[PDB]
Amino acid sequence: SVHVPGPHAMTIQELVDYVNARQKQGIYEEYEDIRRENPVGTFHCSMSPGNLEKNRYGDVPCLDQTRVKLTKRSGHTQTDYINASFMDGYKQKNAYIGTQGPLENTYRDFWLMVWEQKVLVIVMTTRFEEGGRRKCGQYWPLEKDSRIRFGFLTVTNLGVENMNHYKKTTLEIHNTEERQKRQVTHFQFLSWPDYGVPSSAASLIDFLRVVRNQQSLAVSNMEPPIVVHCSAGIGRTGTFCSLDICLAQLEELGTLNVFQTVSRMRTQRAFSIQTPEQYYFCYKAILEFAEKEGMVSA
């Protein structure tokens, strides 16, 4: 895994000073320094013929080096491409698969990937539309008992539960070609603002704990990656994964490093963290969590 503790991990005390010494504008500049870095890798597959129509945004391709390949087949008008990237987690290879919000023409590709990669948990951090901007297609049966067919794969809703900041849906995927069934849990975070970033990270971190527990429980009953997506699969996705990694390190060694985590993540899911606000949010969220845990003395 590219996500190892250090070199130069930072403690909460050191993190406080680092942020004080820099302020909001400082952290904003730090984000621009990262954004200025030339991506490490290439994007030839994502921009090649036949795969262009599979990208929601022409300006958000995925890296060749880490793309998730679909074990497709010969002469049947299709490629092995899906805009999705394997992403490491804290001391864990391929902890997540960061991908864009499925398009009607890639719903089948999305579910095939879920099947082949043995995914048990899917995390969606957007609504289908926000501010008039389309962000994700309705790729799963919304209500209990309804089902959708994608070739030799059938997806059925076994139940839905609405929480204050997220919705949990249990889905059963039936691969009729291999005569096997699997239950997948789908979580849709509902508290990410249409504009800016959450004013408090409490909801997102609690949600992170919900997802971690479900993954742990599913894996125990079955590690496969957790699919995490937002419209382009880089902003909210990158934020969710970066926080998960930093928090993990913080719980194990009491240290972390936002700059390293984001820079490292950007070598697997290109462009992870789309705005300075989101970058700043990663720092602020960690400090807010620190205070809530009674670790901060002002």
Ligand SMILES: Cc1cc(C(=O)N[C@@H](Cc2ccc(C(F)(F)P(=O)(O)O)cc2)C(=O)N[C@@H](CCCNC(=O)c2cccc(I)c2)C(N)=O)ccc1Br
């Ligand atoms: C020129 C062009 C732009 C867009 C677009 O609107 N892009 C959006 C895509 C996007 C990205 C992130 C989000 C998000 F953060 F909300 P999420 O949480 O759902 O992930 C939503 C939507 C955008 O803002 N574009 C970004 C682009 C990101 C960086 N890319 C590049 O610039 C780039 C492209 C190719 C090669 C190289 I080297 C770099 C921007 N402009 O801020 C689409 C088609 C075309 Br043609």
